[PDB]
Amino acid sequence: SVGTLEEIIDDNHAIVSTSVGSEHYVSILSFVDKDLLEPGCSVLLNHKVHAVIGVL
Amino acid sequence: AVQKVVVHPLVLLSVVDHFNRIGKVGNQKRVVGVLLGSWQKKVLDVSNSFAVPFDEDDKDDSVWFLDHDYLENMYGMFKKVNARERIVGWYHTGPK
C-alpha cells in the first residue's frame, strides 16, 4: 500500500497518513534509506503491520 | 394454560445421548430428566435440556429419586450462560 508522511521520528519508525486519514507509527524496511524520506513524500506501506516498505 | 409446543429435535437428541448413557449400565426402568423451556406466549418452546439420575423399585411406586441440588446447580449454570431458558418440565423414554 501507499501512504504519505507527516513527521519523522528517529526510533526507526515515523508517523504516516493513510488515504482517508488514519495515522500510524510504522517502521522502515532498512535497505532503502530514510534520508530519502522528507515530510511531504509518498511512501510504500504494508497491510499487515502497515510498516514503511520503501521509497516511491 | 398451555396452547401448544414448539419443540426442536436438538432436545430430543439430548434425550438420546443420555439414553446411550443408560443403555450401558443396569437399566431398571427408564430415564427421568429435566426439560428446560422457553415459555413466551401460552405457546411453548424448548431450546435445550439436560438429565438427572433416577432409579425406581416397584413395590409401592413411591421410591423414586432425583437430585434437586444437582438440578438447580446445572440450572444455575445454563441460566447464567443463557438467561433465555428456564425449566418447563421433564421427560421419560418409556412410551406408556
Binding site: - | 429435535p9 438420546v16 446411550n20 448413557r21 438429565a51 444437582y70 449454570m77
Partner: protein, 163 residues
C-alpha cells in the same frame, strides 16, 4: 476471548456434574467461533494452543461461522499446530498421505493455506448412529409427511395464480 475464559472453578463444577451425569468422559479439545469473517485462526487461538496441548494430546481446534446456510454447509474447521522445533525434519509426513491426499481435495480456505505455516485441516466425517439415525429419520420424515400423516389428504385460488 482468552485462555482465561476457562474458569477452573467452572471446570471443576461442570465436569464433576457431568461425572455424576451419565459418564466421566475425557475432553478431546476445544471450540470457539468467528462470526465476523471467513473462519481462520486468530491470535488468541495460537496463544492458547500451547495451553491446550499441555492439557490434551491432540488438542484439536474447532472453527465456525454461524451465518452460512440452512442445510448444506459443513462450516466447522479443525487443525493441528505442528511445532517449530521440528523445522529440521520434513513437515506433515502423514505416513501414507493417500487418505491425507483424499483429504487434500479442495485446497480449501486460501488464507488458511496462507497459514499453512505449521497448520493443516483434518478429516471430519459425520458418522452414523444406529441408535439415532433411523429415529432422526423417523422424526424428520414422519413428522413432515403431513405431520400425523392424516391431515391434508390453497386449492381454489391457486387456480387463478397458476393460470
Amino acid at each position: 476471548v482468552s485462555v482465561e475464559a476457562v474458569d477452573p472453578v467452572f471446570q471443576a463444577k461442570m465436569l464433576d456434574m457431568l461425572k455424576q451425569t451419565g459418564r466421566p468422559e475425557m475432553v478431546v479439545g476445544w471450540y470457539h467461533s468467528h462470526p465476523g469473517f471467513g473462519c481462520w485462526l486468530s491470535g488468541v487461538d495460537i496463544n492458547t494452543q500451547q495451553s491446550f496441548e499441555a492439557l490434551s494430546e491432540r488438542a484439536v481446534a474447532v472453527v465456525v461461522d454461524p451465518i452460512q446456510s440452512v442445510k448444506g454447509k459443513v462450516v466447522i474447521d479443525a487443525f493441528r499446530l505442528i511445532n517449530a522445533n521440528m523445522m529440521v525434519l520434513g513437515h506433515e509426513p502423514r505416513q501414507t498421505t493417500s487418505n491425507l491426499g483424499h483429504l487434500n481435495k479442495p485446497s480449501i480456505q486460501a488464507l488458511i493455506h496462507g497459514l499453512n505455516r505449521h497448520y493443516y485441516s483434518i478429516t471430519i466425517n459425520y458418522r452414523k448412529n444406529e441408535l439415532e439415525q433411523k429415529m432422526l429419520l423417523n422424526l424428520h420424515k414422519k413428522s413432515w409427511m403431513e405431520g400425523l400423516t392424516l391431515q391434508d389428504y390453497v386449492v381454489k385460488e391457486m387456480l387463478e395464480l397458476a393460470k
